[PDB]
Backbone:
């Protein structure tokens, strides 16, 4: 039999806690930003007499 | 221990490699009540020297689950203790009868509990081995109502990293 052991089903709340809620949540927020610029400007004159 | 003895000159080496669980005769009502929904159980075995690495695999709800147990050497060739992992207690396992290239019969005993398993290298098992095991069940004083056959398909080698129970 492959089965789940029923131990640890409950914990006793110490008196100093008004609540201990045990709600399970996850939040994942991800932001990825990429910015690239190039500004290339060759300018030239050549001359002869 | 019951009136049972190991395979004479049991060899962990040849007993090594994969075994398929064919059938289990047990007093454990878990197989009696909801004996259906017991998955095809495969048992990779490796000589941990005197102990044996024994990785059961199952499809728990279709989740491939490896359960690596040391069948730790009790100090008698072919008898094992399985650590006594927890309140599960010590489980006295005896390789009672086998030919290492086709079949083996294992006896597993716990306090007030005895269970016997038929394993085969390949499936189907020979009818001679089947009826021999059924005789072993009679000699264990179990009834036919207490023999439960495990399905022949959906064996699941290679439980992942996380679906590995690693009881040790």
Residues:
């Amino acid at each position: 039999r492959l089965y789940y052991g029923d131990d640890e089903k409950y914990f006793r709340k110490p008196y100093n806690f008004l609540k201990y809620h045990f709600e399970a949540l996850a939040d994942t927020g991800i932001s990825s930003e990429f910015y690239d610029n190039a500004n290339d400007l060759l300018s030239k004159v050549k001359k002869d007499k | 221990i019951s009136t049972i003895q190991p395979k004479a000159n049991f060899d962990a080496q040849q007993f090594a490699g994969t075994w398929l669980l064919v059938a289990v005769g047990s007093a454990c009502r878990f197989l009696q009540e909801q004996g259906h929904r017991a998955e095809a159980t495969t048992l990779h075995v490796a000589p941990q020297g005197t102990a044996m690495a024994v990785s059961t695999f199952r499809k728990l709800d279709g989740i491939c689950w490896q359960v690596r147990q040391l069948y730790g050497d009790t100090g008698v060739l072919g008898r094992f203790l399985l650590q006594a992992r927890d309140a599960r207690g010590a489980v006295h396992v005896v390789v009672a009868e086998t030919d290492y290239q086709s079949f083996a019969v294992l006896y597993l005993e716990r306090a007030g509990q005895l269970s016997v398993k038929l394993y085969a290298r390949s499936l189907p098992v020979s009818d001679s081995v089947l009826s021999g095991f059924e005789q072993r069940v009679q000699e264990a004083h179990l009834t036919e109502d207490q023999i439960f056959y495990f399905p022949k398909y959906g064996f699941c080698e290679a439980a992942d990293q996380f679906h590995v129970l690693d009881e040790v």
In short: The beta strands of chain B are 19-26, 42-48, 51-60, 63-71, 73-76, 79-80, 92-99, 103-110, 113-120, 147-149. The helical segments of chain B are 12-15, 29-32, 127-139. Chain B touches chain A at residues 28, 30-31, 58, 60, 65, 67 (CB under 8 Å).
